[PDB]
Write a protein that binds this ligand. Sequence first.
Ligand SMILES: CCCN(CCC)S(=O)(=O)c1ccc2[nH]c(-c3ccccc3)nc2c1
Ligand SMILES: CCCN(CCC)S(=O)(=O)c1ccc2[nH]c(-c3ccccc3)nc2c1
Lengths: 546, 546
Amino acid sequence: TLRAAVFDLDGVLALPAVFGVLGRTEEALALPRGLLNDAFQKGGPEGATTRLMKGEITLSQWIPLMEENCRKCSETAKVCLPKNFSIKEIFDKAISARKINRPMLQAALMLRKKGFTTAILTNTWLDDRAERDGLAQLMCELKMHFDFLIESCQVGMVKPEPQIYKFLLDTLKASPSEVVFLDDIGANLKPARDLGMVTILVQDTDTALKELEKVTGIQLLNTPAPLPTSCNPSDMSHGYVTVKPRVRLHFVELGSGPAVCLCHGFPESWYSWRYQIPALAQAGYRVLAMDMKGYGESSAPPEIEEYCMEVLCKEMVTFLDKLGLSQAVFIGHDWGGMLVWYMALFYPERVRAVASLNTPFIPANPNMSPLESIKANPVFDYQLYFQEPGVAEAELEQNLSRTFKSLFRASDESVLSMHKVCEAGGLFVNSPEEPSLSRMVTEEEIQFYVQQFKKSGFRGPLNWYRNMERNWKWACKSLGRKILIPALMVTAEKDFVLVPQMSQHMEDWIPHLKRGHIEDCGHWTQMDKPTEVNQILIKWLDSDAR
Amino acid sequence: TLRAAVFDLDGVLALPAVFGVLGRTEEALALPRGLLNDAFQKGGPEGATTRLMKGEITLSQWIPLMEENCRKCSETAKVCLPKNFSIKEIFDKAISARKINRPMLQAALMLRKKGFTTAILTNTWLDDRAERDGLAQLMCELKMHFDFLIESCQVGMVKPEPQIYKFLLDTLKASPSEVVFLDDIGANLKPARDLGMVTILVQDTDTALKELEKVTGIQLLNTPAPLPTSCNPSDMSHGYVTVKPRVRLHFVELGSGPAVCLCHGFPESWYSWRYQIPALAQAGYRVLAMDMKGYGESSAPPEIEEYCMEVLCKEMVTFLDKLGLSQAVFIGHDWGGMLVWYMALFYPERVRAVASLNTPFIPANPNMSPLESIKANPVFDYQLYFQEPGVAEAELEQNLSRTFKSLFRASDESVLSMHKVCEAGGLFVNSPEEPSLSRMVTEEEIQFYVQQFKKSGFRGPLNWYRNMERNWKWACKSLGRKILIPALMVTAEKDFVLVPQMSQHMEDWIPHLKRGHIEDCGHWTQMDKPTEVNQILIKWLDSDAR
Ligand SMILES: CCCN(CCC)S(=O)(=O)c1ccc2[nH]c(-c3ccccc3)nc2c1
Ligand SMILES: CCCN(CCC)S(=O)(=O)c1ccc2[nH]c(-c3ccccc3)nc2c1
């Protein structure tokens, strides 16, 4: 019974293959068929390419050797190489043209998710070309999805030498009959077959996947659309900044490029951005996903005023200063969405662009207290419940698993009513003791939140609702301003607290506002519709945030 | 007696001033003298500029108001504004031209170092122009050197209103007679004078500094060249990556731009890069200063093999992968210099550029064991002392303060002999028990190292010398390679272990090698000659690392 799947890079996980471009170059230059491919393989195990694949020489040291082989080959064929024939040029664009074979990676990912140990086995070189980064970026994206990456230039062995196959079985901790091996080269497939491995000769991906699905018994073809890549907490880089004595801010960091600060809502974690962090980093951004003040590994002082918008904003400015960042794109959801609008209002020079998910920007009414206007809308009764220090903490901290299982639900899964929470005497009053596990979350994801909330509980998180009057007074000072920096508002159709209609007057204050909208999406936008969230944010970042 | 110094931004800390460009624009366009300045101040406390300075409106909302004031002014003067008169354009280049007044910041820094509480008090706006980053970068660089930054648009008060002066005294916790106030505008100086503050009317910086030096009694003019900005450990962002189970890597991070990985030597810390971290970040790089394996807050497994070059290099590759970094510039010193050459030799696709301080690149002799070649040079006897597990740890860990005080010394300060350490039976045998404090380090800097080394001691650090044979065998596989990626070698004249002559044959293997050289510099390059190290690295990074 198969338990490991081994994939080649060139012609299997990466398309098009180099020897396919070697053939396309022969045709384009009207050279004899196989001339360039014969030059490439010249001297077999004793030649220039074998030395390169074993790591004896780098790619640059190899170029003039491939040049001489092409001259010597063209001399025997009694042909002429063109005026400006260049191996450096041919190989540069061949490497550059090569992209990930998306259906093949998806099947590799399906196999791994279903218990298989996966590996990439490749005949590759030490790339020291000035353009090496393109390949380095390609390898980084592929390697993260596999248990092993075996490169010929790193092990000093090559395919089809039987030693690399014996090396592969040892790293896999599997006997041959337990391994599926996918290769585009028949000669490199033969030693795996000889040992007793299941082998697939890759030509077109569809035929190879049909063969792979039949042999594994796992459906790889015609599968439902997969969720975006998520985060494993212990595989992330964890950052920590002291913004003031006894107040420390925790963040997860991934990627290079413009700084993208992600600000979660109530009662969440940096982990709420799990499906955005890899996608946004892959899109060419340096993601800094916050544990907001009061949450996770960040400091949770007990005083209410410590959570007023003026203090939180000033602290995010200090966070930027301490990391040596003149600007960041601020993307917020829920309470994070609110903070993000205030960062744009009060510190526009530190805000590259601003994006909110569900949270609209509504100017303060100077002729009315916010505490008396909360009462005007029946949906916001839970806000009044959240007011008295102690009450909601006791209910929310009682059974942590029940809290997140009850809250983290889709549009068609509600167990709790948003209205008359005060009259009922709680948020979980006519709610089950053991709520069913929502479709959006696994048991593992709920437990990550459970463990996070054991450190400081709900006092710090609840204090964000406890600065209404203080927040109002500060917001009133911004009444003559306009948001003129690039801004995005993302509405969610089925969010019944942060309703899309609440965002309708936004253009009066943000005239150049760009919009996004998600249908059949509840309040927990990021985990409800991660593929949609990623498309909207990436499209907006590349057009408006550089 | 003065204890606080308050500085204005425009015309004091930042040159040239805006109203100087307003006058230069009048001349260039042949407009009546003061026309643009009269337009700017139109309506005094009830006008457009006062609203902008108080933060009622943003800069962009202000542009069309300044436009109307210019039209109305030009109408009364009975003149015509040019065909393509634009306030946006005038202000854009005025803000852009404005740089830090370096002698003024240096004096502000001298004052702070000598006990003064320093502050910037400025009449400024909320900048929401598409070009706002230039100013945001200017403010970031200045603000870090002061105890306070008071901005009119943030406090809702302006100079010359006496409330801002009363606000300044409160934040300073000082009475007027304790404060020096430097301003280029006489009108904004008058309320500080009225309260009883020492005031300096800034015109030319030299005259103002002569006045400031006379009144404080502190020498600010004709001072010796200051050391570059250093790091306060608790003001840094601290990053943490798990590279494998039970092996975690700690780093300090500052700045945005290309990733610059700094690799310290034996027996050091990320803190050895203290004078490079701010300079390199200011130069437009994202600095990642490592605590190498075995050191500080990074993991120190006890096994020798865990510190072999193959393992350390593989772990730095994992460090890059986990942070989502396809490449980094690798800058190493001492043992870090060695690692850095091996990263370029084994993973050139992950190495943007490579730089070594003191450590040359010498290829492995395949016809000789390194353990028998260490004996060929008398300087490397301490290496033989470092071999037996336990011996050197006991001596180095005995008195931590004595260890760093004895080791961290300049060329003209040696207390320990590099030769016959085995015969003497130790590194500190004929060395003082209470060594004098070297010129390169303060008591505080030595104690940071003392506290760092209390966690794991010297086992992990010493194990880097305990993989000679293992390292040799791995290095032998690279014997046919060449370093063809951008590379820098920095030699130090008075380093008597890593002598500049040891680097002479390097071009045979690194043909495009760029060089650096530091005269009257010992082994501890970074702290011995920080200004020189910074100049060499920044010049090389901007030409070769982008
Ligand atoms: C009274 C107006 C309501 N909000 C203003 C929206 C412009 S609010 O600032 O009080 C606010 C903001 C974020 C919120 N998030 C939630 C929330 C409630 C239950 C579960 C999760 C989030 N309630 C919120 C209220
Ligand atoms: C035998 C050759 C010596 N070195 C090779 C230089 C190409 S080494 O790799 O053993 C080496 C490397 C870094 C070192 N650093 C020190 C050192 C000694 C005392 C104090 C601080 C550093 N000794 C070192 C030896």
